[PDB]
Symmetry: none
Subunit: 165 residues, 2 copies
């Protein structure tokens, strides 16, 4: 991963999985992460309304220009939600890096997908290294493989396996 | 602080930042820490129901008597929440003493207040001395400086500055 991002994830470690994920999504500067940011609402490719760091919901004011602080508040809430949605399903102790990287993964890919993934089953069997490797299989959308996903998956993989080496 | 407590801090240091904060809140006995303990809902001065060592939610039963057991459940959860809400905002590496000190402070003053604060800004510019000193600015409410908050911030501060001697 870029060295600034690496250092960023390093300092977030004391802050636990949530903070780790927040670095992955927003990046060191808070605007150069694996997710885009947008201060004004827009419809995505599936026609869902979205703003800030990829935030969707029934609470988007279409006429509003959002601040950096609003965007960060909303991410916090959404990450807490991801945690709520997936942590029940992780039946084993994993390191904070691994947890944070799965948050970032699930943020992108959705809770359903994760619940039925092979990645989870390898987590629940204690195969951490094997779970982190499953990430590379998640680069396909519209029967095309995406350079942007393959990169994201590589970076989430590094962090997922951060403790090992 | 009181020696009764200065020791009991050090007692759960190896428990990490959560355990440091949780200590400051309950103190060794359970009432003799920074928060007020109460096993029946009372309406506080601003008219919010409150129970145990400061727990407020919508999850409160108005005639119920809570146990020493159920209040530990509420606190731990509440403190999980504080860590979720503030850590992503903390971009640098910090001692578990310092972090735990901040968990307590935010318990008291709220995530919003914290996210906009000068203190967090000093934290993130690496200035930990400068950070902890900012605790002292948080001793007013309703016009007046309170001696009780003046104490409470000196305590939180002491713990905040445990690394630097």
């Amino acid at each position: 991963m870029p060295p600034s991002l690496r250092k960023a994830v390093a300092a977030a470690i004391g802050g636990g999985a949530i903070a780790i994920a927040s670095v992955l999504i927003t990046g060191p500067s808070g605007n150069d992460g694996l997710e885009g940011v947008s201060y004004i609402p827009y419809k995505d490719i599936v026609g869902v309304w979205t703003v800030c760091h990829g935030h969707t919901g029934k609470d988007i004011m279409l006429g509003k220009t959002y601040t950096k602080a609003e965007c960060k508040a909303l991410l916090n809430k959404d990450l807490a939600t991801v945690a709520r949605q997936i942590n029940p399903y992780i039946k084993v102790d994993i390191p904070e890096t691994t947890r944070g990287a799965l948050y970032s993964f699930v943020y992108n890919v959705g809770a359903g997908n994760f619940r039925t993934s092979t990645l989870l089953r390898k987590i629940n069997q204690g195969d951490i290294k094997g779970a982190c490797d499953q990430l590379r299989r998640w680069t396909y959308a519209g029967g095309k493989q995406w350079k942007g996903l393959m990169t994201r998956r590589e970076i989430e993989r590094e962090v997922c396996l951060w403790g090992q080496q």
